Design a protein around this nucleic acid. Structure first.
Length: 79
RNA sequence: AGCACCGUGGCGCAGUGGAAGCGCGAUGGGCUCAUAACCCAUAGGACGUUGGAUCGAAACCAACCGGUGCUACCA
RNA sequence: AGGGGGGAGUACGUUCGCAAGAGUGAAACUUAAAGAAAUUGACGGAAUGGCACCACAAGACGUGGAGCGUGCGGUUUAAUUUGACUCAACACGGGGAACUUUACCAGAUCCGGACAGGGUGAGGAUUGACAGAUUGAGUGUUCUUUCUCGAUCCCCUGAAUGGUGGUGCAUGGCCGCUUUUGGUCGGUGGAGUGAUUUGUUUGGUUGAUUCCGUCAACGGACGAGAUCCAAGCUGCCCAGUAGGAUUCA
RNA sequence: UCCUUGUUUUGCGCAAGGUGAGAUUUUGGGCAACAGCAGGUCUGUGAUGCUCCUCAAUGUUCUGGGCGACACGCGCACUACAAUGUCAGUGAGAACAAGAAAAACGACUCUUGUCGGACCUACUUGAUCAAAAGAGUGGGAAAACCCCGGAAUCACGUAGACCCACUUGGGACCGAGUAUUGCAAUUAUUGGUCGCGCAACGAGGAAUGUCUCGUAGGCGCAGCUCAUCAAACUGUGCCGAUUACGUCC
């Protein structure tokens, strides 16, 4: 047994801690609304949902430069 | 400068012709609750050097060398 | 004749004695004990008696010489984690460890920081991650990127917690050893003014404070003994998981 | 108990013999007082006082790699194997032992609240050609299976080989090939056959260990630990003596 007290080789860049990367008003950036035609409001989306039972509700996919992705079932439809 | 004695294991020594030993040591064990005390096993020798005598020796003879004592005192 | 112990039977004076000495006989100063008897311990180059295959006799089998496995000491290493050292350390810590176990070394990760008093709008504070890069790591650790989610998770002090960290000379429990030897204690009675003693003693006997005899002791409690477990023999019990006998082919 | 009416004090008992399955603590264990040690253990525990450490931790880390009782001139402790011709050594044939060990782990298929398999071992095959391995089937929850438990020591009128030599006595070291265990066997993990034996060692100094009858010594098996590996420990069986049964040095 026995023991001592000291830990420091150190003196590098240590890791930052992961911290949430915020999007604000996330729903309104997905759902798009239009000029009003015929008194009826036309709702479109820039986000399309993944076809798996788990994602079958409302749960949308993603959009990167070179890939499309689903954060719910961790999937890739590649671009 | 002669005379005398001595030279053998790390150190001190034994050994009068059939020719490597002892006491202190060193090193490693054992006895003891430990230490002294005391046992045992290991390694360690051109027997000063050279010639001679001798069937044959380290032992006797000679030559030289070294050490110590005694007497010498060097135009 | 004596009036605490020393100083001292010394000093001075004097009488006696040939001499050696004898008689008489202080003080200054110093000290808190000196001394007497009895009892219980301890000790003895005093006396006497008992007991042990961890003691010896007799004599069987080894170790100590070699070659291995394992432990310990020491040396070396980044680390070779560590307890234990005469008998009661050293094939011991159920310790024959590939990882785990694991204390030790190099490196990275996670909150298992409860409890919210102090901060966080619908986005909140928040969780998880494909791909690329970092990296020992096709480890979202972290970043880029975007998506995905309890709002306790998150941010700051106080506090809590966990630890094979320290102290076994803080401590409990358990174990070892003293010690496998036969030992330990009180009541009432007896003896002494009592510290005490008898009982628990001289003797014989037994592994045994085990008994007997003598006897101012008597009667108890623990240890010993007994009660418990296994082995040898046997009764009753029992067989379609035990095993024999006879008959016939 | 009985007897010797021996011995002893009539006593406590003792010796020899008898009786008997067994003859004197019948045999071997477990338990075990009073007073203690500054023995060991904080590495047994949600057994703990006070302290140390706490988010870049001494916590957690079943994370990756190394180290551990493992690393190598040397001392010491315990173990195992030998130096062979008293089974002695390689080959063959015969007989023959007992304590003990195994069963459930949320997956599976069963219906409506539950079957089978993860543990042993037999037989058969593999085997129209080494071992080790492989595969299919069956039994046992243990006095049913394994199991008539074919242990080794041992025995042989087996006309077996061998012959006194470091030899065919002993193997230590050392190279190549292969299969199994496991997530991972590299510092060879364990088996299993070839080569290495020309490496030691020829009964062992001073000293020293514990033993009195089913004992000493020789020999083998199981349990323990546990994916794998026991020269260890715990337990059971076989073969089975010599000497003493006394003393205090």
């Amino acid at each position: 047994k026995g023991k001592k007290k000291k830990k420091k080789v150190f003196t590098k860049p240590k890791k930052p801690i992961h911290r949430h990367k915020l999007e604000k008003m996330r729903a309104l950036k997905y759902f798009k609304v239009t000029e009003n035609d015929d008194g009826s409001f036309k709702v479109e989306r820039t986000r399309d949902e993944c076809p798996n039972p788990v994602c079958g509700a409302g749960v949308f996919m993603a959009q990167h430069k070179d890939r499309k992705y689903c954060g719910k079932c961790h999937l890739t439809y590649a671009a």
